[PDB]
RNA sequence: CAUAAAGACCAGGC
């Protein structure tokens, strides 16, 4: 935050869609980086869960200006929040105030030549620490169309490459999330149709022997541009009903089975939490079960 | 014992900055009233 | 020898009371006219790039695959945990590389004091808070790897393959191997038997903790002894 | 108010203090205006890509 | 050692072609970014007051009793002759004090080449014209006395009694013991195997002749080696 | 070694 304040650095984060604001005050039970679960006591006060309002914090996605919007939590374990209290940070916010740049030791002097018109000089320490290392996200989008011979498939069978290019690709052409790619590694598994025309008649004759799809392809895969070298943080899945999504693909079949089962378990924890807490104050009015109620599960 | 906030310049704010998105939220919300009735704009 | 009276019967009373591995009040007496600023600036010239050190190179985490995932049972994210691991200072006596063992489950703020003590690894800051842990079997484990270097080389030209053979889950981290952090010098006067206009150059030295200040100033002292044999030979 | 609150402020008086050169070293003539300026880094658009 | 590639496989090609005792073109290569001005200014800082020398202290003349008399057979006065003896540079190898023998009669401009050669005294400027002599038995004789000092101490606090016991005819003269006169440095670039942005710091050194430049820069080099052991010890 | 069209419009740097 700036060492000089004005009175407007705290209102931009709260008033805009920057700092997460709770809908109704409650008791915080757990805190994660991707979600902040809030146990709001809509019933009698118990550590058994309640009318859960889960809050999805947008973590690492792409904006228009090739940057990232971050939301880091600040509420610790066991802190009763108020309607209007801050819950997570913004892309530059410290707690609730706006903090764009930094505060460094400045010294006004013509150093030697370098600061001629509008140049800024700084020591070796500024790159030894990640004090100005920002996150730059670039989208590599490519739109799907059709072909004269007939449109496509999915496989990782890409000729004219090495082993390290197909090593970070799975059996289905999509690179993993979190792979150390660089200039040269294949992100996108495209190959290009030669057709009957580009082949010589000698391989028309031995492509009366090999296959309809045996030598129909040549390499023009979409790679990393020359000079940039980062990591993969987000992949995309877009498919259209007609033409038979691949299997084996064992890791795509495993992946959102594993993720989707957790997506069921968290949502049944939330709605189970929101209804069984609701009927507890209904059932206590007219009876009591001290030893019998905490043995059977919450469903 | 009560004192002054003691900052640069004696201009005490009595009414803070309002909702900065009132250019957007009031014009669109009054324009197309999803939860309210039909009035002001499309209507 | 004893010679004439310039500086030869003028001993340098430079003595020691040690603070462990991170800061030292360095005293000096006596040196004659105009001998403070060239001292501070020449050993600011040497002690920023000529000093090797052992810093953090590449860190492996558990089932969290890259820097921007989440872990079930932690409040902060893995990027802030690794940011807390960048500032961790570590001393290695005579090993090229070492792997630090760390494991802790249950509730409790894990600090740098939970690291398993090695015979050549000593932690200078046990009070460094890394992250806050919660209930529901929050088991975290890391493998801190220490390598030798000198000064700042970026993480795009060094690129290392420890676990970049078929099991993956490592990525290269920026390394600041430079031990010496801050040296500030005071320039009051001193007096000894020979002459009066003699400067007392009292130094506030600050080191991160990778290399001890005694060994660093002895290495920089014999490097300085290697320096000024330059004016010697002919041609 | 500034000249009243800067004759106070540790360390210097009236803003300026004798520094030392990082290259020469010596007693620096004309104490200079120093401090902690809140600067700001601009973004890296794809224009800055080589 | 060999280490990493910063400066360790970078030899300093600093070589010698000597001009006798008064000026030397000092060459240097290679040193990296921003290493010319701190060199010239730090050894302008050392080489003006930290260097001992042997200059003119107190001169005895013949029957001319003080500085403002006249001598039968000379054109100029004794004050201009002693002014010419102030600028005379003399080298003394290992003697504390030495008396120089000088005598010449008849017509002829007496220069510094008429001084009787001693085994430890070498004249750098034999072409220095002192005064013009005439006929009519113009016999002049002087006893040049050389003492060791350093830098400028005035002639009112030192005051010496060589012949201020009962036979008189001496008075104390201002002494500039400082050998180093001028150092000018050029800051063109150099290139060697490791890196390209390396500065060639070529020096035009000028010395009066009291102390040789090789011995002076070796003494200032080991004084510099005595300087930067300042950051060493604790407390 | 060959492929990522052309054009429109907008935003941006000075």
UniProtKB/Swiss-Prot annotation, chain A:
It comes from Escherichia coli (strain K12). Belongs to the RNA polymerase beta chain family. The keyword Heme does not apply. GO terms for molecular function: DNA binding; DNA-directed RNA polymerase activity; ribonucleoside binding. GO terms for biological process: bacterial-type flagellum assembly; bacterial-type flagellum-dependent cell motility; cell motility; cellular response to cell envelope stress; DNA-templated transcription initiation; intracellular iron ion homeostasis; nitrate assimilation; regulation of DNA-templated transcription elongation. It comes from the Bacteria. The keyword Signal does not apply. Changing residue 117 to K: Disrupts the enzyme's active center. This is DNA-directed RNA polymerase subunit beta. Transmembrane segments: none annotated. DNA-dependent RNA polymerase (RNAP) catalyzes the transcription of DNA into RNA using the four ribonucleoside triphosphates as substrates.
Curated annotation (Swiss-Prot), chains C, E:
Its EC number is 2.7.7.6. (Microbial infection) ADP-ribosylated on both alpha subunits by the phage T4 protein ModA. ADP-ribosylated on only one of the alpha subunits by the phage T4 protein Alt. It comes from the Bacteria. Signal peptide: none annotated. It catalyses: RNA(n) + a ribonucleoside 5'-triphosphate = RNA(n+1) + diphosphate. Belongs to the RNA polymerase alpha chain family. Homodimer. The RNAP catalytic core consists of 2 alpha, 1 beta, 1 beta' and 1 omega subunit. When a sigma factor is associated with the core the holoenzyme is formed, which can initiate transcription. Both the N- and C-terminus interact with different regions of transcriptional regulator CRP. The rRNA transcription and antitermination complex (rrnTAC) consists of RNAP, NusA, NusB, NusE (rpsJ), NusG, SubB, ribosomal protein S4, DNA and precursor rRNA; S4 is more flexible than other subunits. This is DNA-directed RNA polymerase subunit alpha. It comes from Escherichia coli (strain K12).
Swiss-Prot record, chain D:
Co-administration of salinamide and rifampicin or salinamide and myxopyronin suppresses the emergence of resistance to both antibiotics. Transmembrane segments: none annotated. The modification N6-acetyllysine is found at residue 7. The RNAP catalytic core consists of 2 alpha, 1 beta, 1 beta' and 1 omega subunit. When a sigma factor is associated with the core the holoenzyme is formed, which can initiate transcription. The rRNA transcription and antitermination complex (rrnTAC) consists of RNAP, NusA, NusB, NusE (rpsJ), NusG, SubB, ribosomal protein S4, DNA and precursor rRNA; S4 is more flexible than other subunits. In pull-down experiments interacts with CedA. (Microbial infection) Interacts (via flap domain) with Escherichia phage lambda antitermination protein Q; this interaction renders bacterial RNAP resistant to transcription pausing and allows it to read through termination signals. Belongs to the RNA polymerase beta chain family. DNA-dependent RNA polymerase (RNAP) catalyzes the transcription of DNA into RNA using the four ribonucleoside triphosphates as substrates. This is DNA-directed RNA polymerase subunit beta. It comes from Escherichia coli (strain K12). The gene is rpoB. The chain holds residues 1194 to 1243 of 1342 of the full protein.
